[PDB]
Coordinates of C-alpha atoms and ligand atoms in Angstrom, one line a residue:
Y1 CA 106.3 54.2 94.3
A2 CA 109.9 56.7 94.3
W3 CA 109.1 58.1 90.9
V4 CA 105.4 58.6 91.3
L5 CA 106.9 60.5 94.7
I6 CA 109.4 62.2 92.6
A7 CA 106.7 63.5 89.9
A8 CA 104.4 64.7 92.8
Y9 CA 107.0 66.8 95.0
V10 CA 108.7 68.1 91.3
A11 CA 104.9 69.5 89.9
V12 CA 104.1 70.8 93.5
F13 CA 107.8 72.4 93.5
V14 CA 107.4 74.1 89.6
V15 CA 103.2 74.8 90.3
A16 CA 104.0 76.5 93.9
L17 CA 107.3 78.7 92.7
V18 CA 105.5 79.9 89.3
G19 CA 101.9 80.6 91.3
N20 CA 103.5 82.3 94.0
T21 CA 105.7 84.7 91.9
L22 CA 102.4 85.3 89.6
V23 CA 100.8 86.6 93.4
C24 CA 104.1 88.9 94.4
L25 CA 103.9 90.0 90.9
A26 CA 100.3 90.8 90.5
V27 CA 100.0 92.7 94.1
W28 CA 103.5 94.6 93.3
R29 CA 102.6 95.8 89.9
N30 CA 98.7 96.5 90.4
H31 CA 97.9 99.6 92.5
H32 CA 94.1 98.3 92.7
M33 CA 95.4 95.2 93.8
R34 CA 97.4 96.7 97.3
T35 CA 94.6 95.9 99.5
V36 CA 95.5 94.8 103.3
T37 CA 94.2 91.2 102.4
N38 CA 96.5 91.1 99.2
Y39 CA 99.2 92.4 101.2
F40 CA 98.9 89.3 103.8
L41 CA 98.1 87.1 100.8
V42 CA 101.7 88.2 99.5
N43 CA 103.1 87.2 102.8
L44 CA 101.7 84.1 102.6
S45 CA 103.4 83.6 99.2
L46 CA 106.6 84.7 101.0
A47 CA 106.3 82.1 103.8
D48 CA 105.3 79.2 101.0
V49 CA 108.5 80.1 98.5
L50 CA 110.6 79.7 101.6
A51 CA 109.0 76.2 102.4
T52 CA 108.6 75.4 98.7
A53 CA 112.7 76.7 97.6
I54 CA 114.8 75.0 100.8
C55 CA 112.8 72.8 102.6
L56 CA 110.7 71.0 100.0
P57 CA 113.8 69.5 97.9
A58 CA 115.0 68.3 101.4
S59 CA 112.3 66.8 102.4
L60 CA 111.9 64.9 98.7
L61 CA 115.4 63.0 99.7
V62 CA 115.0 62.2 103.0
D63 CA 111.7 60.5 102.1
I64 CA 113.3 58.9 99.2
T65 CA 116.6 58.2 100.6
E66 CA 115.4 57.7 104.5
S67 CA 118.7 59.7 105.2
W68 CA 120.1 63.0 105.7
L69 CA 122.6 64.0 103.1
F70 CA 122.9 68.1 104.1
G71 CA 125.5 68.0 106.9
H72 CA 125.3 69.2 110.3
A73 CA 124.5 72.6 110.2
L74 CA 121.8 72.4 107.3
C75 CA 120.3 69.5 110.0
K76 CA 119.2 72.9 112.1
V77 CA 118.6 75.6 109.7
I78 CA 116.4 73.4 107.3
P79 CA 113.7 72.0 110.1
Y80 CA 113.9 75.7 111.5
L81 CA 113.0 77.2 108.4
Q82 CA 109.9 75.3 107.6
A83 CA 108.8 76.2 111.6
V84 CA 109.4 80.0 110.6
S85 CA 107.1 79.1 107.3
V86 CA 104.4 77.7 108.9
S87 CA 104.3 80.2 111.8
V88 CA 104.5 82.7 109.4
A89 CA 101.4 81.2 107.0
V90 CA 99.5 80.5 110.2
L91 CA 100.0 84.3 111.7
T92 CA 99.7 86.1 108.3
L93 CA 95.9 83.9 108.1
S94 CA 95.4 84.7 111.5
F95 CA 95.9 88.4 110.7
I96 CA 93.9 88.7 107.5
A97 CA 90.9 86.9 110.0
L98 CA 91.5 89.6 112.6
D99 CA 91.4 92.3 110.0
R100 CA 88.0 91.3 108.0
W101 CA 86.3 90.4 111.3
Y102 CA 87.1 94.0 112.9
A103 CA 86.3 95.3 109.5
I104 CA 83.0 93.5 109.1
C105 CA 82.0 92.9 112.8
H106 CA 83.4 95.9 114.6
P107 CA 84.0 98.5 112.3
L108 CA 84.5 101.3 114.2
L109 CA 87.2 100.2 116.5
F110 CA 90.9 99.8 114.8
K111 CA 92.2 101.1 111.2
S112 CA 92.8 98.9 108.5
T113 CA 95.5 100.3 106.4
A114 CA 98.1 98.8 104.0
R115 CA 101.0 100.2 106.3
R116 CA 99.8 98.9 109.2
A117 CA 99.4 95.3 107.3
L118 CA 103.1 96.0 106.4
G119 CA 103.8 96.6 110.2
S120 CA 101.8 93.7 111.0
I121 CA 104.0 91.6 108.7
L122 CA 107.2 92.6 109.9
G123 CA 105.9 91.6 113.2
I124 CA 104.9 88.0 112.0
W125 CA 108.5 87.3 110.8
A126 CA 110.3 88.9 113.9
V127 CA 108.1 86.6 116.2
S128 CA 108.2 83.4 114.1
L129 CA 112.0 83.8 113.5
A130 CA 112.6 83.7 117.1
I131 CA 109.9 81.4 118.6
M132 CA 111.1 78.4 116.2
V133 CA 115.2 79.0 117.9
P134 CA 113.7 76.2 120.0
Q135 CA 113.2 73.7 116.8
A136 CA 116.9 74.7 115.5
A137 CA 118.5 74.1 119.1
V138 CA 117.4 70.5 119.4
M139 CA 118.0 69.1 115.8
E140 CA 120.9 66.5 115.7
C141 CA 122.8 64.9 112.9
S142 CA 124.1 61.6 113.7
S143 CA 125.0 58.5 112.2
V144 CA 123.4 55.1 113.2
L145 CA 127.0 53.4 112.3
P146 CA 129.8 56.2 113.4
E147 CA 132.4 54.2 111.4
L148 CA 130.5 55.2 108.1
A149 CA 130.1 58.8 109.1
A150 CA 133.7 59.9 107.7
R151 CA 132.9 57.8 104.6
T152 CA 129.3 58.4 103.7
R153 CA 126.0 60.3 104.6
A154 CA 123.8 57.3 103.8
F155 CA 123.4 56.2 107.3
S156 CA 123.3 59.9 108.7
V157 CA 119.6 60.5 110.5
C158 CA 118.5 64.1 111.2
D159 CA 116.2 64.2 114.1
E160 CA 115.4 66.2 117.8
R161 CA 117.3 65.4 120.6
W162 CA 115.6 65.5 123.9
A163 CA 117.6 64.9 127.0
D164 CA 114.1 63.4 129.1
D165 CA 110.7 62.0 128.2
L166 CA 108.7 65.0 129.3
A167 CA 110.3 68.0 127.4
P168 CA 109.3 66.6 123.8
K169 CA 105.7 66.0 124.9
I170 CA 105.0 69.5 126.2
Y171 CA 107.2 71.3 123.4
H172 CA 105.2 69.2 120.7
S173 CA 101.6 70.0 122.3
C174 CA 102.6 73.4 122.4
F175 CA 103.5 73.4 118.6
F176 CA 100.6 71.7 117.4
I177 CA 98.3 74.2 119.9
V178 CA 100.1 77.3 118.7
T179 CA 100.5 76.7 114.7
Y180 CA 97.4 74.5 114.7
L181 CA 94.7 74.2 116.8
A182 CA 94.2 77.4 118.9
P183 CA 94.6 79.9 115.4
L184 CA 92.1 77.5 113.5
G185 CA 89.6 77.3 115.7
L186 CA 89.5 81.0 116.3
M187 CA 89.7 81.7 112.6
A188 CA 86.8 79.3 112.1
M189 CA 84.8 81.2 114.7
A190 CA 85.8 84.7 112.8
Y191 CA 84.7 83.1 109.6
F192 CA 81.2 81.9 110.9
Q193 CA 80.8 85.4 112.4
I194 CA 81.9 86.9 108.9
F195 CA 79.3 84.7 107.2
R196 CA 76.3 85.6 109.5
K197 CA 77.1 89.2 109.2
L198 CA 77.6 89.4 105.4
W199 CA 75.0 86.8 104.2
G200 CA 72.3 88.4 106.8
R201 CA 69.8 91.7 106.5
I202 CA 69.8 97.2 107.3
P203 CA 67.8 99.5 105.0
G204 CA 69.1 102.6 103.7
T205 CA 72.4 101.5 102.7
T206 CA 74.6 103.4 100.4
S207 CA 75.7 102.6 96.7
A208 CA 79.4 102.6 98.8
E209 CA 78.2 100.1 101.3
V210 CA 76.2 97.7 98.9
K211 CA 78.9 97.5 96.5
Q212 CA 81.8 96.9 99.6
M213 CA 79.3 94.2 100.9
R214 CA 79.1 92.5 97.0
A215 CA 83.3 93.2 97.2
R216 CA 83.4 91.5 100.5
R217 CA 81.2 88.3 100.2
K218 CA 83.9 87.4 97.2
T219 CA 86.6 87.9 99.1
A220 CA 85.2 86.4 102.4
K221 CA 84.1 83.1 100.5
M222 CA 87.9 83.1 99.1
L223 CA 89.3 83.3 102.5
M224 CA 87.3 80.6 104.2
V225 CA 88.4 78.1 101.2
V226 CA 92.0 79.0 101.8
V227 CA 91.4 78.5 105.7
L228 CA 89.9 75.2 105.0
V229 CA 92.3 74.2 102.5
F230 CA 95.3 75.1 105.1
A231 CA 93.4 73.3 107.7
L232 CA 93.1 69.8 105.9
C233 CA 96.8 69.9 104.2
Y234 CA 98.2 70.7 107.8
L235 CA 95.8 67.7 109.6
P236 CA 97.8 65.0 108.7
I237 CA 101.3 66.0 109.8
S238 CA 99.8 67.6 112.9
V239 CA 97.8 64.3 114.0
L240 CA 101.1 62.2 113.2
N241 CA 103.7 64.3 115.4
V242 CA 101.2 64.7 118.1
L243 CA 100.9 60.8 118.1
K244 CA 104.7 60.1 117.8
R245 CA 105.8 62.7 119.9
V246 CA 103.0 63.2 122.8
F247 CA 101.6 59.6 123.0
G248 CA 104.8 57.8 122.1
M249 CA 103.3 55.7 118.9
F250 CA 105.3 54.4 115.6
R251 CA 107.8 52.9 117.5
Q252 CA 107.6 49.8 116.2
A253 CA 109.8 48.0 113.5
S254 CA 107.1 46.3 112.0
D255 CA 105.0 49.3 111.3
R256 CA 107.9 51.4 109.6
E257 CA 106.9 50.9 106.2
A258 CA 103.1 51.9 106.9
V259 CA 104.5 54.9 109.5
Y260 CA 107.2 56.0 106.3
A261 CA 104.1 56.0 103.6
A262 CA 102.0 58.0 106.1
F263 CA 104.9 60.6 107.2
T264 CA 105.9 60.6 103.3
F265 CA 102.4 61.4 102.2
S266 CA 101.8 64.3 104.8
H267 CA 105.2 66.0 104.5
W268 CA 104.0 66.2 100.6
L269 CA 100.6 67.7 101.4
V270 CA 102.2 70.6 103.3
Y271 CA 104.1 71.6 100.4
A272 CA 100.6 70.8 98.2
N273 CA 99.5 73.9 100.4
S274 CA 101.9 76.5 98.5
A275 CA 100.9 74.7 95.4
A276 CA 96.9 75.3 96.2
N277 CA 96.9 78.9 97.2
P278 CA 97.3 80.6 93.9
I279 CA 94.9 78.2 92.3
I280 CA 92.4 78.7 94.7
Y281 CA 92.8 82.7 94.2
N282 CA 92.9 82.1 90.0
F283 CA 89.4 80.1 91.0
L284 CA 87.9 82.5 93.1
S285 CA 89.3 86.1 93.0
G286 CA 88.4 87.6 89.3
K287 CA 91.5 90.2 90.2
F288 CA 94.0 87.5 90.5
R289 CA 92.2 85.1 87.6
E290 CA 92.7 88.5 85.3
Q291 CA 96.4 89.0 86.5
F292 CA 97.3 85.2 86.0
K293 CA 95.4 84.7 82.1
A294 CA 97.7 88.3 81.2
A295 CA 100.5 86.4 82.3
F296 CA 100.2 83.1 80.6
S297 CA 99.3 85.3 77.6
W298 CA 102.4 87.1 77.6
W299 CA 104.6 84.6 79.0
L300 CA 103.4 81.3 76.9
Ligands
PGW1 C1 98.2 81.6 119.3 C2 97.2 82.1 118.5 C3 96.8 83.7 118.3 C4 96.3 84.5 116.9 C5 94.9 84.2 117.0 C6 93.9 84.9 116.1 C7 93.4 84.8 114.8 C8 91.6 85.0 115.3 C9 91.2 86.0 114.2 C10 89.9 86.7 114.6 C11 89.3 86.2 116.0 C12 88.0 86.6 116.0 C13 87.1 85.6 117.2 C14 85.9 85.7 117.3 C15 85.4 84.5 118.1 C16 83.7 84.4 118.0 C17 83.6 83.5 119.3 C18 81.8 83.2 118.9 O1 81.0 83.8 119.6 O2 81.4 82.1 118.0 C19 80.5 81.5 118.9 C20 80.6 79.7 118.8 O3 81.9 79.7 120.0 C21 81.2 79.3 121.2 O4 80.5 79.3 121.9 C22 82.7 79.2 122.3 C23 83.4 78.0 121.8 C24 84.7 77.4 122.2 C25 85.1 76.2 121.4 C26 86.0 75.5 122.2 C27 86.8 74.9 121.0 C28 88.1 75.1 121.1 C29 88.8 75.8 120.2 C30 90.2 76.2 120.1 C31 89.8 77.9 120.9 C32 91.0 78.4 121.2 C33 91.2 79.7 122.3 C34 92.1 80.0 123.2 C35 91.7 81.3 124.2 C36 93.4 81.9 124.4 C37 79.4 81.7 117.7 O5 78.7 83.3 117.5 P1 77.8 84.0 117.9 O6 77.8 85.0 117.3 O7 76.7 82.9 117.5 O8 77.2 84.6 119.4 C38 77.6 83.7 120.3 C39 77.3 83.3 121.6 O9 76.1 83.7 121.9 C40 76.4 81.5 121.1 O10 77.3 80.7 121.6
SUV2 C1 109.1 67.8 106.7 C2 108.0 68.6 107.5 C3 106.9 69.3 107.0 C4 106.1 69.7 107.6 C5 106.1 69.7 108.9 N1 105.1 70.3 109.8 N2 104.8 70.0 110.9 C6 104.2 70.8 111.6 C7 103.9 71.9 110.3 N3 104.6 71.4 109.8 C8 107.5 68.8 109.1 C9 107.4 68.4 110.9 O1 107.4 67.7 111.3 N4 107.7 69.7 112.1 C10 108.2 70.7 111.6 C11 109.8 71.2 111.7 N5 110.6 69.9 111.4 C12 111.3 69.6 110.2 N6 111.7 68.7 110.1 C13 111.8 68.9 108.7 C14 113.0 67.9 108.1 C15 113.0 68.3 106.3 CL1 113.7 67.2 105.0 C16 112.3 69.7 105.9 C17 111.7 70.1 106.6 C18 111.4 69.9 108.0 O2 110.8 70.6 109.1 C19 110.5 69.3 112.9 C20 109.7 69.2 113.7 C21 108.1 69.2 113.2 C22 106.9 70.1 114.3 C23 108.4 68.2 108.7
SOG3 C1 120.5 80.1 105.2 C2 121.7 78.8 104.9 C3 122.7 79.5 106.0 C4 123.6 78.0 106.5 C5 124.5 77.8 106.4 C6 124.9 76.8 104.5 C7 126.1 76.7 104.2 C8 126.2 75.5 103.4 S1 126.7 74.3 103.8 C9 126.9 72.8 102.8 O1 125.7 72.9 102.4 C10 125.8 71.7 101.0 C11 124.4 71.5 100.5 O2 123.9 70.4 99.5 C12 126.3 70.5 101.7 O3 126.1 69.3 100.7 C13 127.3 71.0 102.2 O4 128.2 69.3 102.9 C14 127.4 71.7 103.5 O5 129.1 71.8 104.6
SOG4 C1 80.5 95.9 121.6 C2 80.5 94.6 121.4 S1 79.4 93.9 120.3 C3 78.9 92.1 120.8 O1 79.6 91.8 120.1 C4 79.5 90.1 120.3 C5 81.0 89.2 120.1 O2 80.3 88.1 119.1 C6 78.2 89.7 119.4 O3 77.5 88.4 119.5 C7 77.1 90.8 120.2 O4 75.6 90.8 119.5 C8 77.5 92.1 120.3 O5 76.5 93.1 121.3
SOG5 C1 116.1 85.6 114.1 C2 117.2 85.0 115.2 C3 118.1 84.2 114.7 C4 117.7 82.7 114.7 C5 119.2 81.9 114.7 C6 118.5 80.4 114.6 C7 118.7 79.4 113.5 C8 119.3 78.2 113.2 S1 120.9 78.3 112.9 C9 121.9 77.7 113.7 O1 121.5 78.1 115.3 C10 122.1 77.5 116.4 C11 121.0 77.4 117.6 O2 121.0 76.0 117.9 C12 123.7 77.5 116.3 O3 124.1 76.6 117.1 C13 124.5 77.8 115.0 O4 125.4 78.6 114.7 C14 123.4 77.6 113.5 O5 123.6 76.4 113.0
SOG6 C1 121.9 68.8 118.9 C2 121.6 69.6 120.3 C3 120.3 69.3 121.0 C4 119.7 69.7 122.2 S1 119.7 68.5 123.7 C5 117.9 69.5 124.7 O1 119.2 69.9 125.7 C6 118.7 70.7 127.0 C7 119.1 70.4 128.0 O2 120.3 69.4 128.2 C8 117.5 70.3 127.3 O3 116.7 70.9 127.9 C9 116.4 69.3 126.0 O4 115.4 68.6 126.9 C10 117.0 68.7 125.1 O5 116.1 69.0 123.8
SOG7 C1 101.4 71.0 127.4 C2 100.7 70.0 127.5 C3 102.1 68.7 127.8 C4 100.8 67.3 128.0 C5 101.7 66.4 127.8 C6 101.4 65.0 128.2 C7 101.6 63.7 127.7 C8 100.4 62.8 127.5 S1 100.8 61.2 127.5 C9 101.4 60.8 129.1 O1 102.9 61.5 129.8 C10 103.0 61.5 131.3 C11 104.0 62.3 131.2 O2 105.3 62.1 130.6 C12 102.9 60.1 131.5 O3 103.2 60.2 133.1 C13 102.0 59.2 131.3 O4 102.3 58.0 131.1 C14 101.4 59.5 129.8 O5 99.9 59.0 129.4
SOG8 C1 98.0 68.9 123.4 C2 97.6 67.8 122.0 C3 97.5 66.5 122.3 C4 95.7 66.7 122.5 C5 95.5 65.3 122.4 C6 93.8 65.0 122.8 C7 93.4 63.5 122.8 C8 93.9 63.2 124.7 S1 92.3 62.7 125.0 C9 92.5 60.8 125.4 O1 91.9 59.8 125.1 C10 91.5 58.5 125.0 C11 90.3 58.0 124.9 O2 90.5 58.0 123.6 C12 91.6 58.2 127.0 O3 92.0 57.2 127.1 C13 92.7 59.5 127.7 O4 91.9 60.3 128.3 C14 93.4 60.4 126.7 O5 94.5 59.8 126.3
SOG9 C1 88.6 75.5 109.5 C2 88.3 75.1 110.7 C3 90.0 74.5 111.4 C4 89.7 73.9 112.9 C5 91.0 73.0 113.3 C6 90.4 71.7 114.0 C7 90.7 70.3 113.2 C8 89.0 69.9 112.7 S1 89.0 68.0 112.7 C9 87.2 67.8 112.8
SOG10 C1 94.9 65.8 117.0 C2 96.1 64.7 117.3 C3 95.7 64.0 118.6 C4 95.4 62.6 118.7 C5 94.6 62.1 119.6 C6 95.1 61.6 120.6 C7 94.3 60.3 121.5 C8 94.9 58.9 121.3 S1 94.3 58.1 122.8 C9 96.3 58.1 124.1 O1 97.1 57.7 123.0 C10 98.0 56.3 123.3 C11 97.5 55.7 122.2 O2 96.9 56.0 121.5 C12 97.8 55.8 124.9 O3 99.7 56.5 125.2 C13 97.0 56.2 125.4 O4 97.1 55.5 126.8 C14 95.9 57.1 125.1 O5 94.5 57.4 126.0
SOG11 C1 99.2 54.8 108.9 C2 99.7 55.2 110.1 C3 100.7 53.4 110.1 C4 100.8 53.7 111.8 S1 100.8 51.7 111.8 C5 100.2 51.8 113.4 O1 100.7 52.1 114.3 C6 100.5 52.1 115.7 C7 101.5 52.9 116.6 O2 101.8 52.5 117.8 C8 99.8 51.2 116.3 O3 98.8 51.4 117.9 C9 98.8 50.2 115.3 O4 99.2 48.9 115.8 C10 99.5 50.3 114.1 O5 98.3 49.9 113.2
SOG12 C1 96.2 54.9 96.7 C2 95.5 54.2 97.6 C3 96.6 54.1 98.6 C4 96.1 53.8 100.3 C5 97.2 53.2 101.4 C6 96.4 52.7 102.5 C7 97.2 51.8 103.3 C8 96.7 51.3 104.4 S1 97.9 50.2 105.6 C9 96.9 50.3 107.1 O1 96.5 51.6 107.4 C10 96.1 52.1 109.0 C11 95.5 53.6 109.2 O2 94.1 53.4 109.9 C12 96.8 51.4 110.0 O3 96.0 50.9 110.9 C13 97.3 50.2 109.4 O4 98.4 49.6 110.5 C14 98.1 50.0 108.0 O5 98.3 48.5 107.6
NA13 NA1 101.7 76.5 103.6

């Protein structure tokens, strides 16, 4: 099982790095690709490259070795960077939904520009880097056998140190609602209103109006799949974290092999999301597909 786990993580690492580099290059090299949505998709690729490059290898060895092998400093930094990546991804997806919902359902309120999208992107990172400092603060690295700590990192564990039973419950309830439930629930409702608008009806609309709607239907369909795939990828880890930290589950030693398997798969699934997003754009965006086809007809 350990080598299938290695092969799964390695496939995702390679596909996510190549795929997300291609997303950044496509938007950067082509003016026709520089849409508000594509600026936010590049930001989602930056969040996903942060998780793929630094957090994915750490999670693979923790899942295999069942120990922390990166020292005390990295015990704070790597969990922090993973929390930052999720906050960036989910706020990026939220801002795309917000942009599309305003552009489509309430067209005359706010202006949707690339410069305003870059302003939002900076704000997303500023917020995410700050709100995830409590995660870095609670991370502690400790040996199960303190006398072996000098000799080896084999019995070293990276985990959250909580001074009371109440604080982890409030924190993990807030983490779930802020980074998963409230933005996805709101995004689901936004896309349902976008769907009703784009796939309904108004006579006497111009050539530029009719063409923009056809283009919008194609993009909205793609974004709905990205949001649904994100909701599915992050659902097992969210459920497991809430069950473990809010409801005090999985503390029995008899269940440890089934618990580790469930968390190992759930951590992998989060990383599979970074590999999924460029694959979704390839199949649901003709603009990205054309770019990827040109990249692979050149590189290979
Ligand atoms: C930290 C997060 C911040 C980032 C979040 C930003 C990202 C979000 C992007 C865009 C937001 C646009 C939201 C658009 C909201 C659309 C809301 C809405 O009206 O949806 C209706 C269904 O919901 C309803 O009945 C209401 C039912 C509510 C469902 C309750 C489940 C909770 C899910 C979680 C909710 C969290 C809310 C937190 C508030 C702060 C169907 O509509 P419809 O046209 O038929 O007419 C309405 C009526 O006449 C029919 O009941
Ligand atoms: C490995 C991994 C992947 C995704 C996760 N996720 N859950 C919700 C959203 N995303 C988590 C997780 O359970 N998180 C996020 C941050 N945390 C974390 N611990 C990490 C350990 C390693 Cl080796 C690498 C990254 C790590 O991120 C601990 C607190 C908790 C909230 C852990
Ligand atoms: C953005 C990152 C900023 C945090 C500072 C990181 C400095 C490297 S620490 C160093 O890294 C190795 C990696 O394998 C471990 O083996 C060592 O034991 C550990 O001491
Ligand atoms: C100015 C408010 S527009 C208003 O926005 C709602 C939000 O959902 C729609 O449901 C309604 O039909 C529509 O009147
Ligand atoms: C953008 C604002 C900067 C975010 C900084 C937090 C990132 C985790 S690094 C970690 O921070 C600890 C706080 O718990 C310090 O004790 C250590 O020096 C260091 O290892
Ligand atoms: C490594 C350092 C781990 C941080 S412990 C942290 O200490 C605070 C004050 O003791 C409490 O507010 C919290 O509940 C608890 O998480
Ligand atoms: C921000 C939302 C935080 C709500 C999380 C509360 C955790 C639900 S379990 C609950 O926790 C109580 C407090 O520790 C205990 O008295 C009970 O025995 C136990 O059933
Ligand atoms: C904020 C993140 C935590 C939210 C989790 C929602 C589920 C809690 S309801 C749960 O359901 C049981 C029956 O199944 C009942 O005995 C109790 O009333 C209660 O413990
Ligand atoms: C795309 C909608 C995501 C909403 C997240 C709630 C999990 C649904 S569990 C039924
Ligand atoms: C999305 C994540 C939310 C998952 C739903 C949580 C519902 C679990 S019921 C709740 O949990 C514990 C045992 O399961 C006990 O401590 C409580 O007495 C019981 O009432
Ligand atoms: C798949 C996840 C493996 C968890 S096993 C599970 O652990 C719970 C924690 O308390 C118990 O309620 C049950 O007895 C048992 O079935
Ligand atoms: C490729 C197919 C391999 C899938 C492996 C599935 C293993 C199921 S273990 C089973 O899971 C339940 C979850 O509901 C828990 O209640 C139990 O404690 C636990 O024993
Ligand atoms: Na992601």
